[PDB]
Design a protein around this ligand. Structure first.
Ligand SMILES: O=C(O)[C@H]1CCCN1
Ligand SMILES: O=C(O)[C@H]1CCCN1
Ligand code: NA
Ligand code: NA
Lengths: 516, 516
């Protein structure tokens, strides 16, 4: 199968009048369909339940964006039987056929871009450009993985020949597994975590994050339309842990793909290590469990370049990114000139309802707002509050961009992932000290360095122990294919998304010899 | 660096006068050294202890083959310290230097071939060809991995460019880990499990199986003379579960490479999924946990060629292989002609002191004899004993080649790994039933099919669910490079040894962007 070489889907900036016009319409149509009900998806049909989940607009939480069915253990078991039955024949599709199905999916997604972006603005409170980047990334995962999957096609493995024999080594998929997706990239990470495993012949039961069930149902409208056979992909919104614990601990669950908090990722990893009664394999678990990411700036840097990238990485999507700059480690001669520039920029940021395209929208939920307001209370005792520190006026969950300065490297707010628009500034002496501080957390996801000294950049390259490292640019927004995404230490298992290596995690190898 | 294309090390058949003479000279050298004491090897030096381990000759267990030091928690902690300090600089060797160290180690091992073979004969009871296959496989792992490592060298990852940026992805080693090696391939698997991780910049602490501590020590003599920096490889003989429990559970052990029984592998994988107090990473555990491997023969087969391969597969090294044919599944047309031919061939096998080059030597230890004889006792209750089934005379742990027939598919002897010279014969109507019966076990390591019907062979390639399938030939003897070796289901985690993909297990990836 021959297609164009992979390119990244361009990210809409809404500067042209046709873009704005297209978006204003998209938003109106999505707002005009608030209250829509989306059932479960199991074995190729939408299955409804007596209980229901409500999804609210974090910009105005009295508004229900939509409701979905709610999955129990029974629904999980049914889905799991539909996934297994599907697998018997889905593993047998020529790779070319599976990859064409992904390409159809991506073209359908692209045709529904504006509607998807609009649903993200309302359901999870992204501004226009964050919602566009999310959707572009989801399209990218499908286009990329459709292509990557063919590099594993029958028989892919390079092996040493032997006289008188044929030795053929090949990859087979694993079986039926479960995906537990995050609310902060509920189009992009939801999509890639499902479509990677499926591309190569696995089948998946997907559990969307509670805050993002409606946008997850819209991705399933795309799968259904694309024409995945019954039970290949299954959609099971539910509340709290019933559904995910049932599948994570289940003997017939083959693998688990998780993106989310460390707390859950640790329980998950430990549970996958156990042989459930009557289980007949060693479960694989791929977990990406967040970060406490830092940007180092030395006194050789472009300070206005730096201040810009820090504000973007600290405050893009209200700091709600596994990849957000939550730490600003400043060397002695960088401290004042960078800090004042970051403060002058950060004080100019608008906060408001996500539909208005503010610099920052709301945090995702009443839970997140409490969690973030509580960390800000803790930071008031650990560092010096110099910007924000407060909830803004409104019923939506608005939080001012917050800066702490003179933060001790070992403070809670310099160790623990806040996931909100909260930056900690840490003063250090020199660039060696900067690296020690950068490396001294339990995490290793993203990290950045602003500097013009080549020797400092190349030193960071070899010693700044993070999976995704960026020099002289923001540390968020890793592009599929360009920057393999995934971390070290308790940022997770280093399962590098948007890379060719990701798909190997979902395949096993068979070696077959025929002596003639 | 440029070396010859990989070839497998020829296995000595001892058909020439020079080779028989070279074997007798090496057997003589080895036994004159039975009085030797071998210390621990920690931080590039031999380190003795007060306690000692004794190694006995399974063919003459009143005869000691050597003694070693005995490590406990404290030498393990010391080796762990030494291994992490080594890693700090060993991770930074150019790959070409690390690969040349391996090639050097391989050349020492090839020059000491007969000595190691002779050590395997006296220490673990291998006949002369089994021993030579084992040493040749160790040399192959050092040669294969030295070359395979370089495919991973800086910057190996294929990524999509982006305008105005350099995007570089590359592999870095994990850290210090522990290898827990088996007694049945105490040169080959021992060497592979250590040098694979080490080739790519990991450091290793090796605990050999108690039954094979003397040949492990001699492999460390090689490591030492080749010049591995202090701390890179460490040798910790121990008794019982002290040393390996300590280290598998340790917060600062990065990965675990394990080959042994399912029982112990299940614990290790459960252990590895736990975050020890103050652990800052998700442990990687690689486990190969045995098999209950079957050869199917249908009525179109070459019946003499089948019976030859079955005997080799079932009785090679007394059946003490994860790859051993321990089930023989015969279709109705094939049952009589194949069973009689196997009985005729198995009845002319010799058993005796391994150094006489019998077809079978002893089982490895008193405890192995117990286990095997105990299964023979269960076997008598479950099917028909029709050859063997008994201990043979001599203090050596000699057991007769044993065959049970009319074994139900789900009988214990058809399900549990016995690891001794015991074959269970299963009668089935046709190939469809034959394949059901082959698949119906907890395991999925090796398998075999004898048949001239292409459709049955090509059906099996697709649906005989074992990681190493062999047609019209033996099912043991997987060659490094040729047949990537590792299993499905409870045969472990499909870590394919002697394969390019093996080294990827000991790496993580970093992605570094510079925006110019
Ligand atoms: O924010 C980022 O860097 C990428 C990682 C996965 C979601 N988007
Ligand atoms: O016997 C075999 O099949 C190979 C696997 C590893 C040891 N020798
Ligand atoms: Na919502
Ligand atoms: Na011994």
């Amino acid at each position: 199968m021959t297609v164009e070489p992979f390119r990244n889907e361009p990210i809409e900036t809404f500067q042209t009048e046709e873009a704005r016009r297209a978006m204003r319409e998209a938003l109106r149509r999505v707002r005009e369909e608030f209250g829509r009900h989306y059932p479960l998806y199991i074995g190729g049909e939408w299955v409804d339940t007596k209980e229901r989940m409500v999804s609210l607009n974090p910009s105005a939480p009295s508004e229900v964006v939509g409701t979905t069915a709610k999955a129990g253990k029974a629904e999980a078991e049914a889905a799991l039987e539909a996934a297994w039955k599907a697998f018997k024949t889905w593993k047998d599709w020529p790779q070319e056929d599976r990859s064409r199905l992904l390409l159809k999916a991506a073209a359908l997604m692209r045709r529904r871009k504006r509607e998807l972006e609009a649903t993200l603005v309302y359901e999870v409170g992204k501004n226009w450009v964050e919602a566009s980047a999310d959707v572009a990334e989801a399209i990218d995962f499908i286009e990329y993985y459709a292509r990557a999957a063919l590099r594993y096609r029958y028989p892919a493995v390079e092996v040493v020949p032997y006289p008188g024999e044929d030795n053929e080594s090949f990859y087979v998929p694993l079986g039926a597994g479960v995906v537990i997706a995050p609310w902060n990239f509920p189009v992009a990470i939801f999509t890639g975590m499902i479509v990677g495993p499926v591309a190569v012949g696995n089948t998946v039961i997907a559990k969307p994050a509670e805050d993002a069930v409606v946008v997850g149902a819209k991705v399933f409208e795309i799968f259904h339309e694309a024409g995945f056979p019954p039970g290949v992909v299954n959609f099971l919104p539910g509340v709290g842990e019933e559904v995910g614990a049932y599948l994570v601990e289940h003997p017939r669950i083959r693998f688990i793909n998780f993106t989310g908090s460390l707390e859950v990722g640790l329980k998950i990893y430990e549970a996958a290590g156990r042989l459930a009664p009557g289980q007949t394999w060693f479960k694989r678990a791929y977990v990406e469990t967040g970060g406490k990411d830092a940007i180092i700036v030395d006194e050789t840097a472009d300070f206005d370049l730096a201040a810009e990238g820090v504000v973007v990485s600290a405050y893009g999507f209200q700091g709600q990114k596994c990849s957000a700059a939550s730490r600003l480690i400043l060397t002695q001669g960088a401290y004042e000139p960078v800090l004042e520039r970051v403060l002058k920029r950060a004080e100019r940021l608008s906060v408001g309802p996500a539909e208005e395209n503010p610099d920052l929208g709301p945090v995702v939920s009443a839970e997140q707002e409490r969690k973030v307001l509580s960390y800000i209370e803790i930071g008031k005792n650990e560092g010096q509050l110099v910007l924000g520190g407060k909830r803004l006026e409104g019923e939506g969950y608005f939080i001012a961009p917050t800066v702490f300065t003179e933060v001790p490297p070992k403070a809670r707010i310099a160790q623990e992932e806040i996931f909100g628009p909260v930056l900690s500034v840490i003063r250090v002496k020199d660039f060696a000290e900067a690296l020690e501080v950068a490396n001294d957390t339990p995490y290793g996801l993203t990290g950045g360095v602003y500097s013009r000294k080549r020797e400092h950049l190349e030193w960071a390259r070899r010693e700044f122990h993070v999976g995704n490292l960026y020099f002289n640019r923001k540390i968020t927004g890793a592009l599929v294919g360009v920057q393999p995404f995934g971390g070290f230490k308790l940022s997770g298992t280093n399962a590098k998304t948007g890379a060719l290596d990701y798909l190997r995690l979902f395949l096993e190898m068979k070696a077959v010899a025929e002596r003639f």
